[PDB]
Amino acid sequence: SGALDVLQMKEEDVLKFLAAGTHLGGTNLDFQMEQYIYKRKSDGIYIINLKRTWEKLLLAARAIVAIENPADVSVISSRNTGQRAVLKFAAATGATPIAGRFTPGTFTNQIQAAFREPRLLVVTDPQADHQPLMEASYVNLPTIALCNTDSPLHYVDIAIPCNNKGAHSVGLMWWMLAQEVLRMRGTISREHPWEVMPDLYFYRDPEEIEKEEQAAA
Amino acid sequence: PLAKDLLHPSPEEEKRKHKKKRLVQSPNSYFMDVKCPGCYKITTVFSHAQTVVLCVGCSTVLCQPTGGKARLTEGCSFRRKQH
Amino acid sequence: ISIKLQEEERERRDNYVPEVSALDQEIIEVDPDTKEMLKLLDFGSLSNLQVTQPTVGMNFKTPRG
Amino acid sequence: GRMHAPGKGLSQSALPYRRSVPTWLKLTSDDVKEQIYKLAKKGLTPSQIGVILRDSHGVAQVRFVTGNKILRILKSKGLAPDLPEDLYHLIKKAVAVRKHLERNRKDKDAKFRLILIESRIHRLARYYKTKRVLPPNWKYESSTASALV
Amino acid sequence: MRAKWRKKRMRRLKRKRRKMRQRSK
Amino acid sequence: EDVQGKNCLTNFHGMDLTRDKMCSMVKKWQTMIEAHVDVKTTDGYLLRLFCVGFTKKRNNQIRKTSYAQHQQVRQIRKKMMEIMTREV
Amino acid sequence: TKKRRNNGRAKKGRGHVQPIRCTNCACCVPKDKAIKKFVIRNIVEAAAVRDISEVSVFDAYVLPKLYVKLHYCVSCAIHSKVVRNRSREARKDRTPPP
RNA sequence: CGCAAGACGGACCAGAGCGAAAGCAUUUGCCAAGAAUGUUUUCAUUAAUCAAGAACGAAAGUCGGAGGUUCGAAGACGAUCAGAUACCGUCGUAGUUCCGACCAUAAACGAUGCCGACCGGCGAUGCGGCGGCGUUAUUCCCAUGACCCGCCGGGCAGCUUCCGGGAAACCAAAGUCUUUGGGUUCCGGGGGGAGUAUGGUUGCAAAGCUGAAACUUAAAGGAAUUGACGGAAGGGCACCACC
């Protein structure tokens, strides 16, 4: 990510951030997130530094590529938004998804059915996905987190500063991270705007799913 | 944050802090070239004056004392002078 | 429950993608303060960034009680 | 923490690092001393002198401009008071309170604040007798106090 | 026996000892 | 004051507010400001005018309380007394 | 053992508060300690707002309300079922109930 | 509708303020006092805590006046009751109020000595100061108020956290303690006997301050858990319950 040109932030990537809204923080600020910030607005909303966002994205992707067997990375979302995004990320990268309800004791109770024993976690929200962050602290699990400006950084080893609230922002942030782990692995080249479209990862409200079910004809 | 540059406080952080609690102790006051338009002479007034600084050869009364910074009378301008 | 397909609206339909993405805005709405931070990156001037007149009267907090 | 209050105030005056005089100040150390003499003759304390100087005449610290400080400039020539200004002001306050408390025996709060002020006096008296800037024979008595204005 | 009433009893018992001691004076 | 013949001729004796209204006005989280003025008209009628005032929570006021200082209260009270004298 | 942090009452930096009298009983209770409940209440509930408005000399006359600030003795209050005992978790809830 | 007297200061009134604590709430004036902030003012170690000694010290209570509205120890009754010298009710003296003199005690409590340093996060509030788009008033600009968004200090607090501690309940202090030493005052040593006897001392008195022993005893006690129990709160079931 650093002092390098091949992994430097490109122009269409900035348009994809600014369009999604990954530069819009909360109204609140976590004390641990004060470095991943530029300034407030009027209306009180904190603006994230998209460079620092990209620096954490590549650091995260670097950590994800360093895991040799991909099938032991846990890609966790509980909140609606990320459910689809993580389910596609694991298709792209050959990781294992946990979309929705996280059973307490998946990482801890060795007799449970959902006893997955990963080497690295990715987390859509530290607040909503707090149980797996806590259970990472019982079986040594590094955690990557998609952290809003008011996301608690307890048990978070790389915090990617985003707007993990908004549906566009999350789908985008997962797509960026999925496309970067593949580029670093060497499954895509960096000269081709990637065939997979960031709209593929977006959560779709069932008002907008029943907008598709009508408007085909 | 664990790691803070305690020797190198960014000037946004230093001017924020209490004057006594700054890495090196530094006041929040300054001297003003206060000039009234009626008179010719530039008087040196202290920002946190706490007296009635008069025009010597009376054309006016320049500042009036308050809690902190004195009120410079309407008509008067000020340059903050430094070394 | 857990069946073979999973289940032709979750495996097949979830590969739904429109003509052009919602991130393909011709005119991106933008405040002067994220213009101020992109100006302190390599991205000082883009063509498809229409900077709004800034929001006036800071009045966003929920009244207490 | 204050002497006779629970107050943990931090309203201190904070001198700058650079003891070096500024540039703009055109008054030489002698004319500052001459103006200090002019203020002392009018009937002002080293506290009141220092305020009037830094306000109207842009002289931050007399110690910075000259070598010496305002009481030691008063004292060298003999414009300094016989008993210190701060112990004067406590004795002045104690005579004010005691006069109020002559016809207000009900005012128990006053009486308690008098004892706190009396303690400030005795405490400073004891300090200045170690530095012999008061006679060893001196002792603040509240009956002898009204003559000490 | 509430501790306040134990005190009151012991206080009135002490008052009846400065009666039998008040005769020899 | 006078009774002519099937006509009780009456004269103003004192205005009062309805307990209903007076109670409705006294809300928590604001300062009540009362005043009273011993005054005399140009004709020799002597009145005691009691004023009441309540500080207003502003249009954009996010802070819960709407209290005056005491100097603010007593300057208001001083203007109440000044005006009730001035207009009697 | 200490049940409440704020020892039942709402004084922190006082030492003394003026007492009031519980309305049901008449027991001297500290103001801050007392369970104060303000009651705005129509002089007639529902059965008579029909009948009285019909015999209202006026056309479109709103009724008055009755404004009484009740104080309560802690016993006064719990017997009268104004405040219930709560679980040691739910004791810490200070939001007035919906 | 008035008149008189004496209490008392509702609602506003807050986990708000001030005070060393006890305490302090109509208006206005006078009187001295005070913390906090502001300070490129002054003195220059003057300080922290404290045997002796001292000031203030709720309520009740005592002595001599003044006043006595309400309320009400004692007492007189009227009920309840087996009894009821009590709870309930009607009267009601001392007292409650004011003045001068005592008394010096309260679960006088944050049951938490004072001073100082350090170690988390958060949004509030009160006081002062400083800065910043905007709205409103004195409209005629200012500059001041009223909101608004921040920061700094000082205060009463609150929430939150595996800082750490603790027997735990809990505590940003009750932490920085076997990795034990920042300064200093008071004070505890199983339960009773006992805050008793005795001596001194203060007090007009009531009593307060200091204060044992014999003897007796295997526990008394703290916090938390489970159960049973309630003349506590809520929910649920049953024609061996009701409708």
Swiss-Prot record, chain A:
UniProt PTM comment: Acylated. Acylation may be a prerequisite for conversion of the monomeric 37 kDa laminin receptor precursor (37LRP) to the mature dimeric 67 kDa laminin receptor (67LR), and may provide a mechanism for membrane association. Cleaved by stromelysin-3 (ST3) at the cell surface. Cleavage by stromelysin-3 may be a mechanism to alter cell-extracellular matrix interactions.
Modified residues (N6-acetyllysine): 51, 88
Residue(s) carrying Phosphoserine: 42
Primary subcellular site in the record, as a coarse category: membrane
Compartmental location: Cell membrane; Cytoplasm; Nucleus
Start and end residues of each stretch annotated as Laminin-binding: 160-179
Residue ranges of the region described as Interaction with PPP1R16B: 53-112
Entry annotated with the keyword Kinase: no
Residue positions where Phosphothreonine is found in the record: 96
Gene Ontology biological process terms, A to Z: ribosomal small subunit assembly; translation
Entry keywords, A to Z: Acetylation, Cell membrane, Cytoplasm, Host cell receptor for virus entry, Host-virus interaction, Isopeptide bond, Membrane, Nucleus, Phosphoprotein, Receptor, Repeat, Ribonucleoprotein, Ribosomal protein, Ubl conjugation
Annotated family: Belongs to the universal ribosomal protein uS2 family.
Protein name, as recorded: Small ribosomal subunit protein uS2
Organism: Oryctolagus cuniculus
Chain's gene name: RPSA
Span of the entire protein shown here: 2 to 218 of 295
Curated annotation (Swiss-Prot), chain B:
Superkingdom of origin organism: Eukaryota
Keywords: Cytoplasm, Metal-binding, Nucleus, Phosphoprotein, Ribonucleoprotein, Ribosomal protein, Zinc, Zinc-finger
Described function: Component of the small ribosomal subunit. The ribosome is a large ribonucleoprotein complex responsible for the synthesis of proteins in the cell. Required for proper rRNA processing and maturation of 18S rRNAs. Part of the small subunit (SSU) processome, first precursor of the small eukaryotic ribosomal subunit.
Similarity section: Belongs to the eukaryotic ribosomal protein eS27 family.
Protein name from the UniProt record: Small ribosomal subunit protein eS27
GO cellular component assignments: cytosolic ribosome; cytosolic small ribosomal subunit; nucleolus; postsynaptic density; small-subunit processome
Molecular-function GO terms, alphabetical: structural constituent of ribosome; zinc ion binding
Signal peptide residue numbers: none
Principal subcellular localisation of the protein: cytoplasm
Bias-annotated ranges (Basic and acidic residues): 1-15
Region annotated Disordered, chain positions: 1-22
SUPFAM superfamilies listed in its UniProt record: Zn-binding ribosomal proteins (SSF57829)
Annotated positions binding Zn(2+): 36, 39, 55, 58
Gene name as annotated: RPS27
Cellular localisation: Cytoplasm; Nucleus, Nucleolus
The record's free-text note on cofactor binding: Binds 1 zinc ion per subunit.
Residue numbers bearing the Phosphoserine modification: 10
Gene3D superfamilies: Zn-binding ribosomal proteins (2.20.25.100)
Zinc fingers (C4-type), renumbered ranges: 36-58
Lineage, uppermost ranks: Eukaryota, Metazoa, Chordata, Craniata, Vertebrata
Assembly and interaction partners: Component of the small ribosomal subunit. Part of the small subunit (SSU) processome, composed of more than 70 proteins and the RNA chaperone small nucleolar RNA (snoRNA) U3.
GO BP terms in the entry: ribosomal small subunit biogenesis; rRNA processing; translation
Membrane-traversing stretches: none
Cofactor: Zn(2+)
UniProtKB/Swiss-Prot annotation, chain E:
Localisation: Cytoplasm
GO molecular function, one term: structural constituent of ribosome
Organism: Oryctolagus cuniculus (Rabbit)
Gene: RPL41
Family, similarity comment: Belongs to the eukaryotic ribosomal protein eS32 family.
Gene Ontology biological process: translation
Pfam families to which the protein is assigned, alphabetical: Ribosomal_L41 (PF05162)
One Gene Ontology cellular component annotation held by this UniProt entry: ribosome
Oligomer status and interactors: Component of the small ribosomal subunit.
Record-given protein name: Small ribosomal subunit protein eS32
Positions of disulphide bridges: none
Curated annotation (Swiss-Prot), chain F:
Residues of the full protein shown: 89 to 176 of 264
Localization per record: Cytoplasm; Nucleus; Nucleus, Nucleolus
Family recorded in the similarity comment: Belongs to the eukaryotic ribosomal protein eS1 family.
ADP-ribosyltyrosine: modified positions: 67
Coiled-coil intervals: none
Superkingdom of this protein's organism: Eukaryota
Name of the gene encoding the protein in the UniProt record: RPS3A
Organism lineage: Eukaryota, Metazoa, Chordata, Craniata, Vertebrata
Protein name according to UniProt: Small ribosomal subunit protein eS1
PTM annotation, UniProt: ADP-ribosylated at Tyr-67 by PARP1 in presence of HPF1.
Cystine crosslinks: none
Quaternary structure and partners: Component of the small ribosomal subunit. Mature ribosomes consist of a small (40S) and a large (60S) subunit. The 40S subunit contains about 33 different proteins and 1 molecule of RNA (18S). The 60S subunit contains about 49 different proteins and 3 molecules of RNA (28S, 5.8S and 5S). Identified in a IGF2BP1-dependent mRNP granule complex containing untranslated mRNAs. Binds with high affinity to IPO4. Interacts with DDIT3. Part of the small subunit (SSU) processome, composed of more than 70 proteins and the RNA chaperone small nucleolar RNA (snoRNA) U3.
